[PDB]
Enzyme design. Structure first.
Site, mmCIF file in Angstrom:
data_model
loop_
_atom_site.group_PDB
_atom_site.id
_atom_site.type_symbol
_atom_site.label_atom_id
_atom_site.label_comp_id
_atom_site.label_asym_id
_atom_site.label_seq_id
_atom_site.Cartn_x
_atom_site.Cartn_y
_atom_site.Cartn_z
ATOM 1 N N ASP A 3 -14.398 1.668 1.352
ATOM 2 C CA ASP A 3 -13.831 2.169 0.190
ATOM 3 C C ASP A 3 -14.655 1.810 -1.306
ATOM 4 O O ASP A 3 -14.285 2.392 -2.112
ATOM 5 C CB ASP A 3 -12.284 1.583 -0.043
ATOM 6 C CG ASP A 3 -11.430 2.027 1.263
ATOM 7 O OD1 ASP A 3 -11.625 2.963 1.618
ATOM 8 O OD2 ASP A 3 -10.299 1.415 1.330
ATOM 9 N N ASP A 24 0.904 -1.234 0.051
ATOM 10 C CA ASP A 24 0.042 -0.079 -0.058
ATOM 11 C C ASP A 24 0.796 1.276 0.046
ATOM 12 O O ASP A 24 1.689 1.131 0.747
ATOM 13 C CB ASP A 24 -0.824 -0.031 1.256
ATOM 14 C CG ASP A 24 -1.851 1.199 1.350
ATOM 15 O OD1 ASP A 24 -2.143 1.865 0.140
ATOM 16 O OD2 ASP A 24 -2.853 1.359 2.217
ATOM 17 N N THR A 59 -3.436 8.348 -4.324
ATOM 18 C CA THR A 59 -2.522 8.987 -3.437
ATOM 19 C C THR A 59 -1.167 8.944 -4.121
ATOM 20 O O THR A 59 -0.717 10.030 -4.292
ATOM 21 C CB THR A 59 -2.671 8.111 -2.277
ATOM 22 O OG1 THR A 59 -4.057 8.049 -1.421
ATOM 23 C CG2 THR A 59 -1.670 8.758 -1.120
ATOM 24 N N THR A 60 -0.695 7.826 -4.584
ATOM 25 C CA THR A 60 0.336 7.970 -5.259
ATOM 26 C C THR A 60 0.471 8.743 -6.594
ATOM 27 O O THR A 60 1.509 8.909 -7.048
ATOM 28 C CB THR A 60 1.234 6.533 -5.366
ATOM 29 O OG1 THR A 60 0.318 5.655 -6.193
ATOM 30 C CG2 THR A 60 1.415 5.848 -4.128
#
Lengths: 493, 71, 242, 240, 50
Positions: free
Chosen positions: A361, A44, A77-78
């Site tokens: 999610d 993650d 996010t990344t």
């Protein structure tokens, strides 16, 4: 001087250095070496960044911005850090060697962000929000490669029923229009219920409580119980009459059900026993606001001030029947009380704990499609299609901003190149052919992860909502410009 | 050996084997330590010759059974 | 400046070498003809065992590479209960053949994807190669050869002939033949440093530590009745000394 | 509980064996082996409470004494007595017994058995190599890494002969020569490595067998462990 | 046999094309030429990569 501006780009490159291969579904596993001798093998992206110890202060700013995006959406996010990190790499020779003013670069990114959002709106495709089968392949991005892959067919019915229940169009130009007006926080909050089955799990609308009956002999079936809410419990504020006097104020309407926030003494149980009303203690304060919305009983502090306007209407069943060796209470009915309570049943607590985070999610991605009724191509197709439009608009600018504007197209092609570096093929050979396929192919040419050969996305049908693509490029510009706003770093209290 | 402090654990194997002779039969402790030390010297030439220690251990098991039958 | 995207495949090259160092430790420890190594850390207690899980738990390894290998032995022991050393030998050797393909440009994800394809194809050959064994109780002769497989590994093969009837008759005696289940906790284990291991025998019943000591007790009692007696047969005193 | 000196002379005339300082955990299993229920009061004792046991004899040792409850009709219990001269002999024997019980435990649970001595690893490495070459249905680039998996399964038969000093290449060619004759005929013959003689052997006659559940999770288990080691591009040092 | 395959991999390595892809296309083409009952020579094209 100029040394602080170089350290800002270096710190942004060091943070993105870890997540270089962490982008995409093919992301590999990382090993974090702790000083105590422990290791973290999770792949993650945002879970590793919280444990990374950093030195340069700009690295901490990237961690706070990634934490905000992690709470709103589960993925991407990344993507923001890599997209914003590659901008400083292409603008490094422009800021130093070319001697370009930093605000000009910041102003160019603001104008490029506006044109980037217009291209995303053009490449978007219409999607039906009322189609239950169309939402299966969308939410599946947060489903597959997880334990819920077997129950995914049943998991789609749980997410769609919660979103469609609390959404309200209310379209008009007077007070402003929220699109579907979804509230995830209060209404969609899920409480795990032990025992039961996953296949038989249904979406309940109401408030659920696991507390049992406080009296040994009581009627287990009530036709129409009326919920009565109160603040101060039944107890001594003469001691026997004071407790009875507080009960007579509630019995004025002769209720068939009594719910107390705090505990109930044994003295009040005998007075309410002859009145034909059930006593329920141990009720949390946060749930009191949801009970008033599914019932309509006005919350009142003093018992003597309790209004008679309370109603017990829209109460489905009183059945106390034991489920999972524990007595439950089901207030669910056949109507929508402007809320719902998702009941997750399973064969153990470890399974329910995994479904909890997975369902939250899954519904977050579900709302992403509900908010913006459009889809964007995934697998690096959206990032490459925008870079093609940047080369055409760069010729019509005719200004000093043209040089930093062309550097954006080089950063837009880094996301599809990342998936190629994890694919194993030649990155230079694939990016050269992929760029030419979007001109005559109507941006239908994506990248296949499993195979690794460039193919169209019309067959596999890989699509992602637009709001994720919009918030990804919007935060990246705000993160890249913020690093350029600080030209000097000082220390001391 | 009880009053001496043994450092290397390889010697402790011979010390523990020596105590076995004193507890049960009480006699012959010198015959156990000296003979076991010579078996390592004659096996040093076999290890250097290229003979694996696996067949060396197996050879002692066959030679031990032949000796006990002749006693 | 200096936009690089430098050349990786540093690091793990050492981890592959670190895997070869740990592989050689358990390489000679596998098989009945292998070598028996002594590992004593801080406890002053001499212990010799070839079990791969025990060797890793008795050493403190600072290298992060052997940490994941140590976790693999814990999962195989709690489920399969065997093959602790074999799995370690397969992980280290597989990294050796996969390291030569690193300089060729082979991507590690395809290396992982190629293993899942070979694993699914191995299940087809595994179903045809395996042989089903009958539940009949006449297999005790066949269980003698199976029990020696695990015994010959951890000893010099001289003790296996002694423990062959003990281990074989241990499971069949406690467990009647039905569906049921098996529990290894019901079998007690007594440790005694006095007698030699060659004289050991199987105990069908239960043994106790402290027995009664009287000079006139008979040596052998045949067909004795066991009666649990919870009352105190010895004189008792007041809680305060008197 | 303990025994007073007054009852010592009483039990001697009737030849009644007396015991003291009994373990509480051991007495819970005596009800299953003997069958007698625990009697809290003699006044309530019944003649059916008395159980049944066989020959009971106590070994004579100065430091400790043992009691044998053995030779019972339906004991439904067992005890493994581990003896040894030294301290390491007790730890090695205890490890060999616990490894043997868990190996036999998979025989009653799982009816499938696999031969050992490298018989499964040699047959699997040879089958996977010739299976993909005939079908050619996977990929051209993928079969490159598949060959590394087949060559990694042959280290086990080469390791067994390496410790004894035998040539691993000599024993490898002898097994492949016997497998070629088995592919022509329609019969089924298993080949394995014999460490004592050095030639091949029949694992059914020799009696070398390995559990199915152990080897099934060995290939799948070692696959995920060896894969995750190659997935980490950079060692991450942080937290301090 | 493996020492003779470095020459075709060396020529393609300097050109930038993946030596793993050119090795699979040649081996797959030679297998189809034997079943077609003809003689067709195969070689490494450095410019195109096939």
């Amino acid at each position: 001087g100029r040394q602080a501006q170089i350290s800002n780009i270096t710190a942004a490159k060091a943070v993105a250095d870890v997540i270089r291969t962490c982008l995409g579904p093919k992301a590999m596993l990382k090993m974090l070496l702790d000083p105590m001798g422990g290791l973290v093998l999770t792949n993650d992206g945002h879970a590793i960044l919280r444990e990374i110890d950093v030195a340069h202060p700009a690295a901490k700013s990237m961690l706070e911005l990634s934490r905000t995006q992690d709470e709103e959406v589960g993925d991407g996010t990344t993507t923001v850090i890599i997209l914003a990190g590659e901008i400083l790499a292409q603008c490094a020779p422009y800021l130093i060697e070319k001697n370009i003013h930093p605000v000009i670069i910041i102003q160019a990114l603001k104008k490029a962000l506006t044109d980037a959002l217009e291209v995303i709106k053009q490449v978007s495709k219409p999607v039906d929000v009322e189609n239950d089968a169309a939402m299966k392949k969308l939410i599946q991005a947060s489903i597959g490669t997880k334990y819920v892959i077997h129950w995914s067919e049943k998991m789609c019915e749980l997410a769609l029923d919660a979103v469609k229940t609390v959404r309200k169009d209310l379209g008009q130009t007077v007070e402003g229009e929220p699109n579907f007006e979804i509230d995830i926080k209060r209404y969609v909050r899920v409480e795990k219920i032990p025992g039961g089955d996953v296949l038989d799990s249904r979406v309940l609308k109401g408030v659920l409580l696991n507390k049992d009956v406080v009296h040994p002999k009581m009627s287990r079936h009530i036709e129409n119980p009326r919920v009565v809410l109160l603040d101060c419990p039944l107890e001594y504020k003469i001691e026997e009459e004071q407790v009875q006097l507080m009960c007579e104020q509630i019995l004025a309407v002769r209720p068939t059900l009594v719910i107390t926030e705090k505990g109930v003494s044994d003295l009040a149980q005998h007075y309410l026993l002859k009145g034909g009303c059930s006593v329920l203690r141990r009720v949390k304060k946060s749930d009191n606001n949801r009970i008033a919305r599914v019932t309509g009983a006005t919350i009142v502090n003093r018992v003597e001030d309790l209004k008679e306007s309370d109603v017990g209407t829209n109460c489905g069943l009183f059945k106390v029947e034991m489920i999972g060796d524990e007595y439950f209470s089901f207030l669910d009915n056949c109507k929508e009380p402007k809320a719902c309570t998702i009941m997750l049943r399973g064969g153990s607590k470890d399974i329910l704990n995994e479904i909890d985070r997975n369902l939250q999610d899954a519904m977050a991605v579900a709302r992403n499609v509900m908010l913006s009724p459009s889809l964007s191509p995934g697998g690096g197709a959206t990032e490459m299609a925008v870079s093609v439009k940047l080369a055409e608009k760069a010729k019509q600018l005719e200004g000093i901003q043209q040089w930093p504007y062309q550097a954006v197209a080089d950063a837009m092609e880094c996301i599809p190149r990342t998936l190629i570096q994890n694919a194993g093929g030649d990155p230079i050979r694939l990016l050269s052919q992929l760029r030419a396929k979007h001109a005559q192919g109507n941006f239908t040419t994506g990248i296949d992860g499993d195979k690794g050969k460039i193919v169209d996305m019309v067959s596999y049908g890989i699509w992602e909502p637009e709001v994720i693509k919009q918030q990804s490029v919007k935060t990246a510009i705000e993160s890249a410009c913020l690093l350029l706003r600080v030209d000097d770093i000082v220390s001391g209290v | 050996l009880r009053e001496l402090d043994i450092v290397h654990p390889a010697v402790k194997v011979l010390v523990m084997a020596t105590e076995q002779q004193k507890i049960d039969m009480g006699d012959g402790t010198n015959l156990v330590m000296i003979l076991a030390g010579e078996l390592l010297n004659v096996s040093e030439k076999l290890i250097s010759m290229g003979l694996s220690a696996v067949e060396i251990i197996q050879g002692y098991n066959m030679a031990r059974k032949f000796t006990l039958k002749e006693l | 400046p200096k936009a690089e995207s430098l050349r990786r495949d540093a690091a793990l090259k050492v981890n592959v070498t670190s895997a070869e160092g740990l592989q050689s430790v358990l390489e000679t420890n596998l098989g009945p003809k292998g070598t028996l190594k002594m590992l004593v850390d801080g406890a002053g207690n001499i212990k010799l065992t070839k079990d791969g899980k025990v060797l890793l738990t008795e050493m403190q390894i600072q290298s992060p590479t052997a940490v994941l290998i140590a976790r693999a032995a814990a999962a195989q022991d709690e489920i399969t209960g065997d093959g602790t050393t074999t799995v370690v030998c397969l992980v280290g050797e597989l990294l050796r053949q996969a390291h030569r393909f690193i300089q060729e440009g082979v991507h590690p994800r395809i290396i992982t994807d190629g293993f899942e394809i070979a694993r699914k194809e191995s299940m087809k050959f595994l179903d045809e190669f395996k042989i089903s064994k009958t539940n009949l109780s006449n297999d005790r002769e066949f269980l003698l050869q199976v029990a020696r497989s695990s015994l010959l590994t951890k000893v010099d093969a001289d003790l296996t002939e002694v423990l062959t009837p003990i281990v074989t008759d241990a499971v069949l005696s406690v467990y009647d033949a039905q569906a049921d289940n098996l529990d290894l906790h019901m079998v007690e284990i007594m440790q005694m440093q006095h007698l030699s291991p060659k004289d050991t025998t199987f105990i069908k019943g239960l043994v106790l530590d402290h027995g009664g000591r009287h000079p006139d007790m008979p040596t052998r009692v045949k067909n004795a009745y066991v009666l649990i007696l919870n009352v105190s047969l010895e004189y008792e005193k007041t809680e305060v000394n008197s | 509980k303990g025994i007073d000196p007054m009852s010592l002379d009483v039990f001697a005339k009737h030849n009644i064996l007396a015991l003291r300082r009994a373990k509480r955990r051991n007495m819970e299993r005596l009800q299953l082996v003997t069958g007698g229920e625990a009697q809290n009061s003699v006044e309530d004792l019944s003649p059916q409470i008395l159980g049944f046991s066989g020959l009971v004899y106590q070994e004579t040792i100065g430091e400790e004494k043992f009691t044998y409850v053995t030779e019972n009709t339906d004991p439904k219990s067992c005890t493994i007595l581990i003896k040894g001269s030294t301290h390491y002999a007790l730890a090695q024997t205890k490890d060999a017994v616990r490894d043997g019980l868990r190996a036999v435990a998979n025989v009653l649970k799982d009816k499938n058995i696999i031969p050992g001595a490298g018989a499964f690893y040699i047959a699997l490495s040879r089958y996977l190599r010739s299976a993909n070459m005939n079908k050619l249905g996977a990929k051209g680039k993928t079969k490159t890494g598949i060959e590394a998996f087949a060559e990694a399964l042959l280290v086990i038969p080469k390791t067994l002969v390496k410790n004894s000093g035998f040539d691993p290449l000599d024993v490898l060619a002898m097994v492949e020569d016997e497998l070629d004759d088995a592919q022509d005929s329609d019969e089924t013959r298993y080949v394995g490595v014999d460490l004592n003689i050095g030639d091949s052997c029949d694992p059914t006659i020799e009696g070398i067998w390995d559990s199915y559940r152990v080897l099934r999770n060995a290939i799948t288990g070692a696959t995920g462990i060896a894969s995750n080691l190659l997935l980490c591009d950079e060692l991450l040092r942080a937290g301090r």
